[PDB]
Design a protein around this nucleic acid. Structure first.
Ligand SMILES: Nc1ccn([C@H]2C[C@H](O)[C@@H](COP(=O)(O)OP(=O)(O)OP(=O)(O)O)O2)c(=O)n1
Length: 580
DNA sequence: CCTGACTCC
DNA sequence: GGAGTCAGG
């Protein structure tokens, strides 16, 4: 059964062929400044295992890695590329990434290792990484013979699977999406991750000191009001205090007990002074635990930067996600939380943070795909879309739209953009499911093209088995035929929503590629730091801001051409907070 | 590991 | 809705 390979003591020329499957193995989950434990190369001449201390000190091997004309096929090339960047080594010529190929073919398979990808093509001559390295505390790199066989089997699987994966991508009309969008993007994400974002840790620490004082004060008030100490962070002890001791109304349950979500608590505040204090304690506690202490824990001491990892192969809509830290959920809506952004600063003296965001990209994409005459006209006039939606839903003029009317319309728009259910919209607006349905009905009367689109896309999903985005990203929807109303309805909502969210993801990814090219052409030092779904964050010398003010929005706006314009807003300043 | 809560888009 | 993190259990 064993797979033959050369356990090489040195690099030879036959290992440096112009086409190879390459494995550069980084076992730590967070690959920043992490060890490379082994290397495997499979090519027309054979299968090879190399020790990294050897290969990575060999000038011929390093040249080969960096030579764009030497083509490599890999799985999760970004992990290898970043780990190699920390060692001062450039990885070029990666022409196929099996992780990104599998992700595009079917994001729902949850492919996160070579074995899982291989199984899509009935190839099982490779073990799952979890089986080799173990999990959790028991996780460890195995002895060399076991390690080397595993890496060689992964390389062999990649070597064999490239053709069938590319063939299926071609059949799906997704090969350009892989080769021209996701693969080039992977390189850009690697650069962003490696650059990192500078943190003003002293400022974070000062905030933490103040929060600790405020938390102690509120905490003690809560105990006084409760007539008893308890763990406020325990949903169980808190529920006992609120709903048994203090006898507050139970307005909502969880599957295991009493709900204490903020929405519920706000409704209970009139009955007892403890409630507003718990809400305040929660708010401060979230900041302290997640955005002060949690952030400080992942700052690299050598440079005071944080280096996120963008998971490019996870979400079902084509979005990225961000981990360790997550830099896509830093507070902004409320001022107390927004101040956390003062801690994210430029990495060089006399540089600034520049932030550019699409204005209503999801609803603009919807206008385009649905060809809804009224929605397209609204965006061609660059109307405030929530005010316009209120005018239409309520049949009033602009100067008759009250704040609460605009709020209801905005909630409907939020619902369309995220594909939430009537129940969800009812919750969000604190109204009956019945009234939520009525809102949706008025929306479709004013936007009949959107109605027709939603009908048609659900039918298309049922017929084809999947829906697609503008650039041919796919999502399979097997639950669309379910005889369970809730399950089916969830799938119908995903059919409606994925082309919206997913096409918006496609567009910003293309914009990132275009922007990186333009910055290089223009010889700017500006570079990308972060993407937050519909916005891009850069830093640059202060002397580049005026140019960026023209260049960045233009590139973002021109990434695709739709039936409506795209519009990008932008700001800059001395910290991320000030880039507003 | 699971639940519940909460932060962003 | 759907990502990730925290805390509790
Ligand atoms: N072999 C292909 C063909 C297309 N695409 C993706 C990227 C393209 O930018 C996008 C749009 O393709 P087209 O411009 O070719 O449009 P089509 O002719 O395919 O029709 P439609 O876009 O309506 O599907 O689809 C792809 O990834 N691989």
């Amino acid at each position: 059964a064993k797979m033959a390979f050369t356990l090489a003591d040195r690099v030879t020329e036959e290992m440096l062929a112009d086409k190879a499957a390459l494995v550069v193995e980084v076992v730590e989950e967070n690959y920043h400044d992490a060890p490379i434990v082994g290397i495997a190369v499979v090519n027309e001449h054979g299968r090879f295992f190399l020790r990294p201390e050897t290969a990575l000190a060999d000038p011929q091997f390093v040249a080969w890695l960096g030579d764009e004309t030497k083509k490599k096929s890999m799985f999760d090339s970004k992990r290898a590329a970043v780990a190699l960047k920390w060692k001062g080594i450039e990885l070029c010529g990666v022409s196929f990434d099996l992780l990104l190929a599998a992700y595009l073919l079917d994001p729902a398979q949850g492919v996160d290792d070579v074995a899982a990808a291989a199984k899509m093509k009935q190839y099982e001559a490779v073990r799952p990484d979890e089986a080799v390295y173990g999990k959790g505390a028991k996780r460890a790199v195995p002895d060399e013979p076991v390690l080397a066989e595993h890496l060689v089997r992964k390389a062999a699987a990649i070597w064999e699977l490239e053709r069938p994966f590319l063939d299926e991508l071609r059949r799906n009309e997704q090969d350009r999406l892989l080769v021209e969008l996701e693969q080039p993007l992977s390189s850009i994400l690697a650069e962003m991750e490696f650059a990192g974002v500078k943190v003003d840790t002293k400022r974070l620490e000062q905030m933490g000191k103040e929060l600790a004082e405020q938390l102690g004060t509120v905490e003690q008030r809560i105990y006084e009001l409760a007539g008893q100490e308890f763990n406020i962070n325990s949903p169980k002890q808190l529920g006992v205090i609120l709903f048994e001791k203090l006898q507050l109304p139970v307005l909502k349950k969880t599957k295991t007990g009493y709900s204490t979500s903020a929405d519920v608590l706000e409704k209970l505040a009139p009955y007892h002074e403890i409630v507003e204090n718990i809400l305040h304690y929660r708010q401060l506690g979230k900041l302290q635990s997640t955005y002060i202490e949690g952030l400080l824990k992942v700052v690299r001491p050598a440079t005071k930067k944080v280096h996120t990892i963008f998971n490019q192969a996870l979400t079902q809509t084509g979005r990225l996600s961000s981990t360790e830290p997550n830099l896509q959920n830093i507070p902004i809506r409320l001022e107390e939380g927004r101040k956390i952004r003062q801690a994210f600063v430029p990495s060089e003296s006399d540089w600034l943070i520049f932030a550019a965001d699409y204005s209503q990209i999801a609803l603009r994409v919807l206008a385009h795909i649905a060809e809804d005459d009224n929605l397209m006209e609204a965006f061609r006039r660059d109307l405030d879309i929530h005010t316009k939606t209120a005018m239409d839903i309520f049949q009033v003029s602009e100067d008759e739209v009250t704040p609460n009317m605009r709020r209801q319309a905005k909630a409907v728009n939020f619902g369309i953009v995220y594909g939430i259910s009537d129940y969800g919209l009812a919750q969000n607006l604190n109204i009956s499911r019945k009234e939520a349905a009525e809102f949706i009905e008025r929306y479709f009367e004013s936007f009949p093209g959107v109605k027709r689109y939603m009908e048609n896309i659900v039918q298309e999903a049922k017929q084809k088995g999947y829906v697609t985005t503008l650039l041919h990203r796919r999502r399979y929807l097997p639950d669309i035929t379910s005889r369970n109303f809730n399950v089916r309805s969830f799938a119908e909502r995903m059919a409606m929503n994925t082309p919206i969210q997913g096409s918006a993801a496609d567009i910003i990814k293309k914009a990132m590629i275009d922007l990186n090219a333009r910055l290089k052409e223009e010889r700017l030092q500006a570079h990308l730091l972060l993407q937050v779904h519909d916005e891009l964050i850069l830093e640059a010398p202060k002397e580049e801001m005026e140019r960026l003010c023209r260049l960045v929005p233009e590139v973002m706006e021109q990434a695709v051409t739709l039936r409506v314009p795209l519009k990008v807003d932008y700001h800059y300043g001395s910290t991320w907070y000030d880039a507003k």
